[PDB]
Amino acid sequence: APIFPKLEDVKMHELIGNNNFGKKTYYVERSRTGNLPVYSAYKNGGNKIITEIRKIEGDVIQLRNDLQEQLPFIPKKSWSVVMQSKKIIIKGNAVEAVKRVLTKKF
Amino acid sequence: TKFLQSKSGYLIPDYELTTLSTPLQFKRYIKEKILPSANDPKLAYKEAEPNAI
Amino acid sequence: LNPLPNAAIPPKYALVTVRSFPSLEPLTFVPVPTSTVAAPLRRDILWRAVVYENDNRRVGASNPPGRSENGFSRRKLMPQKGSGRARVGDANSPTRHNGGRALARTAPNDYTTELPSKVYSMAFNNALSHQYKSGKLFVIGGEKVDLISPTPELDLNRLDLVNTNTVEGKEIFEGEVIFRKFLEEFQLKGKRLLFITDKTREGLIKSSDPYKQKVDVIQKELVEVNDILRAQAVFIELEALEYLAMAHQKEILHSVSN
Amino acid sequence: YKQYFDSLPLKLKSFFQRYPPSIKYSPVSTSTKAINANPFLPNKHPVTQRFHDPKYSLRRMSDVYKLALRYGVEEFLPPIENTKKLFFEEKYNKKTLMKGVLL
Amino acid sequence: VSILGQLKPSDGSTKSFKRLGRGPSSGLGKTSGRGQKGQKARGKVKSWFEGGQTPIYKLFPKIGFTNVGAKPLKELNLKRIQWFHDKNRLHLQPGEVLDMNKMRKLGLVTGPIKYGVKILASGKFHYNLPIALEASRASAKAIAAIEKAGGKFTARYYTPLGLRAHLNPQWFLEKRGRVPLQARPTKRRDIDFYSKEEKRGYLVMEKDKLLQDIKEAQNK
Amino acid sequence: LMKTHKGTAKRWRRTGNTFKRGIAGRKHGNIGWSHRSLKALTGRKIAHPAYSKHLKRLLPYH
RNA sequence: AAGUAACUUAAGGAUAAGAAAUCAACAGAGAUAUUAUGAGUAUUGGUGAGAGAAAAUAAUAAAGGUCUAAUAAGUAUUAU
RNA sequence: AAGUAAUUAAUAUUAGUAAAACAAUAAGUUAUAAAUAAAUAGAAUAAUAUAUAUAUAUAAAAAAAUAUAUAUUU
RNA sequence: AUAAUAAUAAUAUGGUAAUAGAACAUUUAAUGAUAAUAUAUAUUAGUUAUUAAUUAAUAUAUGUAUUAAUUAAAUAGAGAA
Ligand SMILES: [Mg+2]
Ligand SMILES: [Mg+2]
Ligand SMILES: [Mg+2]
Ligand SMILES: [Mg+2]
Ligand SMILES: [Mg+2]
Ligand SMILES: [Mg+2]
Ligand SMILES: [Mg+2]
Ligand SMILES: [Mg+2]
Ligand SMILES: [Mg+2]
Ligand SMILES: [Mg+2]
Ligand SMILES: [Mg+2]
Ligand SMILES: [Mg+2]
Ligand SMILES: [Mg+2]
Ligand SMILES: [Mg+2]
Ligand SMILES: [Mg+2]
Ligand SMILES: [Mg+2]
Ligand SMILES: [Mg+2]
Ligand SMILES: [Mg+2]
Ligand SMILES: [Mg+2]
Ligand SMILES: [Mg+2]
Incomplete structure (x- = not known):
């Protein structure tokens, strides 16, 4: 299929501005292979283990809030967000749990 | 959009064409953006002075 | 319950007006992907791309002569002891008025830098999206998409100005005159202009030659992020935009999921 | 058949020029x-x-x-x-295996 | 105005290189980190020179040899195959064999394959694919799991050129108009390995002419 | 480009995130000593942190 | 260090190399000349300081394959 | 008037992609499996070391040292 | 769940060799209005917790900034040879 489709092919609700995705909603893309974008990283020589959630668009704060609600066992202070690239960082390894939560919707 | 721009004499950006979805939204945008500068030439936008007051 | 209440499916298209060059009259809308024209602004990615391009554009003509390439004989100026004056060697020492330069460079100096292709493509998409968001990207095309408003007789569907070589009139001809009329009609005289084309447009090149100080014409192959970001008004043909969007596209395989 | 004889490479075509099939x-x-x-x-x-x-x-x-x-x-x-040179299938077929491999 | 005057790098992606010999209050002044005097102050000395005492690269003995005849094999476990299956990334038409060519094409085994691939059995407990497999060899547990799942495995012999032909045959078809014939085993190790049955050697499992020729040589 | 230091290459091998080595002192003068004691002079040891940095610099591509 | 500096001799717009008594390994390639990977791997050393390839895959390149020789003897090979 | 250049290796931070990354003509380099001087050996018999792989020893284990397994492969 | 400024309690702030953060002056490249009622340089006197910029007066040159700001780089800072 062509990269630019015909004007009659596109619906009104597929365009930007519509469907109010810009306010308090979020989305996470799966990798080019079809897997969740949650990864483990080892930092500061290998003694600092973290979990990174990426390929996010929308409200990362809202995503963090919902993930916190679904994974209450993780202390609230262990979560951080890098806004310049919109990634969520969790102290420690929680790849399996975060994948278990995300796969229910994404 | 084509008639509105043609008979108004101003070009509405394509991003706003894609975003705004009702004629009253068009009216609000045009009133709030273009009309002030047109009425007051001093209150214009300068490309070299974006954050001007 | 609802594990992720606020999840949503993002938009995937945005509209650009196709127009005819000599007068930018709309003809049709054409949907273009958001990854191309509505990407969020990443000034850091743009910085990466611009620094990479600027580094690769350098010449490296710096060439100060060191104490080897400076042209003095390799002889001791004064004896080591008994002269009563500080110790000296040859006449090339950097500590001397006509001496060489310490730690001197030798042209051609290499200032090339490399950057991943995916990052470069992301930066290019970001620059195009920035121009579109600023409302300074104009799309000029036709003859391959359905038009709901016919093109004017005087205008063209290509980023070119025909009827230029016909100079058997007066000291001036139609090309430059039409270009100036376009210039003053759209109120952009000392403003940076960029013209991305599919193939060479000799008429446009000749007609815009007088304003070389502010107008640049480039083919789709040779455009750069610096050109796009420098231009205060960027015109791009529809086929050129198609080509650039295809080239700088995220790749997807299979990816079947519930 | 010009368009099928000329499609042959330079080496083969020159060889045929020098050594025609007739002889x-x-x-x-x-x-x-x-x-x-x-x-x-x-x-x-x-x-x-x-x-x-x-x-x-x-x-x-x-x-x-x-x-x-x-x-x-x-x-x-x-x-x-x-x-004393064979090529491709002919060689593979009538190749006598090594004394080392066999014994 | 143009973004070119407002671009900035991402935080944590740039630092300031330590500038030497440019003032006392800079913290790196006259000595510029060298210290006071010595060979290291105004001269160059190896980092691993230890003043004369027998070095760590002399005291100990030379151990071992390098086997130039080595044939390292890329490792492929069964869990990856099952994972591709469950991800629907294992596109095999019915009655088709999963060999090294298909591993490379599908992405099971990635990167350059110098000599071959060996199938190991790490996800054997969860392997249930009845497909057929080909490789340079496989572990005993891998053989057992593959057969238990209703599959089939055989170990085949490839040289460098033969494996290149196997992986990318259209390259040979385009450049030369023909794919090279696979070379028969010539060593003793290869013939022995592929004549073993517990290894699922292809020579024995397909009763090919080479073993018969060897037998006719011995019986004479 | 740097070159592997062949002496270190012959006397050391890469294992895990470190290097291995043989023992020193069991190539002559062994008679008269206890076998159960010389057993400690047969086999391999691992690199020591005091010289791990030296080894890393001596074998850049290991 | 280094077959480098230097000295000496002799050509041309270029010189040199060049179409296998070559590689390779039972499957095959098909002349020279540079470049990247192969690879600081094989190899080598008072086994010290250190030195270090070729197959093969790509890039530049030209029409790149040709006959002029009665097909080559103190030559191949051997010892030093 | 004085810590600079290339050609490399290791480490740290951010950014892109991510069980893949860089290239995209073929190749090739890291990662994906630990071990052994090396060899045709290579990780749960219905579960966490008391199981399994390699090296030393083998009827086979035990013993030393590393390493792998508790919707989702790192 | 940040950022800026301010407030309270507590602790700490000598430093050679050395380590680690931050910033300023000079020049060059990219973007970049304004203009003799301005800009640059110099002297004197004031202001900002001041290696720097600024305000006033005076003097010279110039219809005028590689200017403010963000980046990239240095022949980037001298009482010590
Ligand atoms: Mg740079
Ligand atoms: Mg100090
Ligand atoms: Mg001393
Ligand atoms: Mg001193
Ligand atoms: Mg010292
Ligand atoms: Mg001594
Ligand atoms: Mg021994
Ligand atoms: Mg004892
Ligand atoms: Mg010649
Ligand atoms: Mg040499
Ligand atoms: Mg001859
Ligand atoms: Mg002869
Ligand atoms: Mg001899
Ligand atoms: Mg055992
Ligand atoms: Mg202090
Ligand atoms: Mg104190
Ligand atoms: Mg200086
Ligand atoms: Mg001075
Ligand atoms: Mg001073
Ligand atoms: Mg002095």
Whole structure:
């Protein structure tokens, strides 16, 4: 299929501005292979283990809030967000749990 | 959009064409953006002075 | 319950007006992907791309002569002891008025830098999206998409100005005159202009030659992020935009999921 | 058939120019003065009775024969039995295995 | 105005290189980190020179040899195969064999394959694919799991050129118009390995002519 | 480009995130000593942190 | 260090190399000349300081394959 | 008037992609499996070391040292 | 769940060799209005917790900034040879 489709092919609700995705909603893309974008990283020589959630668009704060609600066992202070690239960082390894939560919707 | 721009004499950006979805939204945008500068030439936008007051 | 209440499916298209060059009259809308024209602004990615391009554009003509390439004989100026004056060697020492330069460079100096292709493509998409968001990207095309408003007789569907070589009139001809009329009609005289084309447009090149100080014409192959970001008004043909969007596209395989 | 003869490579085409299929070249070494002297084989000079190196070395003969096989033309080239060299399937079939491999 | 005057790098992606010999209050002044005097102050000395005492690269003995005849094999476990299956990334038409060519094409085994691939059995407990497999060899547990799942495995012999032909045959077809014939085993190790049945050697499992020729040689 | 230091290459091998080595002192003068004691002079040891940095610099591509 | 500096001799717009008594390994390639990977791997050393390839895959390149020789003897090979 | 250049290796931070990354003509380099001087050996018999792989020893284990397994492969 | 400024309690703030953060002056490249009622340089006197910029007066040159700001780089800072 062509990269630019015909004007009659596109619906009104597929365009930007519509469907109010810009306010308090979020989305996470799966990798080019079809897997969740949650990864483990080892930092500061290998003694600092973290979990990174990426390929996010929308409200990362809202995503963090919902993930916190679904994974209450993780202390609230262990979560951080890098806004310049919109990634969520969790102290420690929680790849399996975060994948278990995300796969229910994404 | 084509008639509105043609008979108004101003070009509405394509991003706003894609975003705004009702004629009253068009009216609000045009009133709030273009009309002030047109009425007051001093209150214009300068490309070299974006954050001007 | 609802594990992720606020999840949503993002938009995937945005509209650009196709127009005819000599007068930018709309003809049709054409949907273009958001990854191309509505990407969020990443000034850091743009910085990466611009620094990479600027580094690769350098010449490296710096060439100060060191104490080897400076042209003095390799002889001791004064004896080591008994002269009563500080110790000296040859006449090339950097500590001397006509001496060489310490730690001197030798042209051609290499200032090339490399950057991943995916990052470069992301930066290019970001620059195009920035121009579109600023409302300074104009799309000029036709003859391959359905038009709901016919093109004017005087205008063209290509980023070119025909009827230029016909100079058997007066000291001036139609090309430059039409270009100036376009210039003053759209109120952009000392403003940076960029013209991305599919193939060479000799008429446009000749007609815009007088304003070389502010107008640049480039083919789709040779455009750069610096050109796009420098231009205060960027015109791009529809086929050129198609080509650039295809080239700088995220790749997807299979990816079947519930 | 110009458009099928000309599609052949330079080496093969020049070889045919120099050695037309019309002449049937001998499978065995002959006099260097013979009309049907085989280029691939070392002929013997009749006045001084000493061999001459083949007009086409083993590299060049292999190249031309391989191209001829690729484009099907086989009978048009002179024989290559005496040249102790076989190619592709023929070699694979009548290859006698090593004494080391067998015993 | 143009973004070119407002671009900035991402935080944590740039630092300031330590500038030497440019003032006392800079913290790197006259000595510029060298210290006071010595060979290291105004001269160059190896980092691993230890003043004369027998070095760590002399005291100990030379151990071992390098086997130039080595044939390292890329490792492929069964869990990856099952994972591709469950991800629907294992596109095999019915009655098709999963060999090294298909591993490379599908992405099971990535990167350059110098010599071959060996199938190991790490996800054997969860392997249930009845497909057929080909490789340079496989572990005993891998063989057992593959057969238990209703599959089939055989170990085949490839040289460098033969494996290149196997992986990318159209390259040979385009450049030369023909794919090279696979070379028969010539060593003793290869013939022995592929004549073993517990290894699922292809020679024995397909009763090919080479073993018969060897037998006719011995019986003479 | 740097070159592997062949002496270190012959006397050391890469294992895990470190290097291995043989023992020193069991190539002559062994008679008269206890076998159960010389057993400690047969086999391999691992690199020591005091010289791990030296080894890393001596074998850049290991 | 280094077959480098230097000295000496002799050509041309270029010189040199060049179409296998070559690689390779039972499957095959098919002349020279540079470049990247191969690879600081094989190899080598008072086994010290250190030195270090070729197959093969790509890039530049031209029409790149040709006959002029009665097919080559104090030559191949051997010892030093 | 004085810590600069290339050609490399290791480490740290951010950014892109991510069980893949860089290239995209073929190749090739890291990662994906630990071990052994090396060899045709290579990780749960219905579960966490008391199981399993390699090296030393083998009927086979035990013993030393590393390493792998508790919707989702790192 | 940040950022800026301010407030309270507590602790700490000598430093050679050395380590680690931050910033300023000079020049060059990219983007970049304004203009003799301005800009640059110099002297004197004031202001900002001041290696720097600024305000006033005076003097010279110039219809005028590689200017403010963000980046990239240095022949980037001298009482010590
Ligand atoms: Mg740079
Ligand atoms: Mg100090
Ligand atoms: Mg001292
Ligand atoms: Mg001193
Ligand atoms: Mg010292
Ligand atoms: Mg001594
Ligand atoms: Mg021994
Ligand atoms: Mg004891
Ligand atoms: Mg010549
Ligand atoms: Mg040398
Ligand atoms: Mg001869
Ligand atoms: Mg001869
Ligand atoms: Mg000799
Ligand atoms: Mg055991
Ligand atoms: Mg202090
Ligand atoms: Mg104090
Ligand atoms: Mg200086
Ligand atoms: Mg001075
Ligand atoms: Mg001072
Ligand atoms: Mg002085």
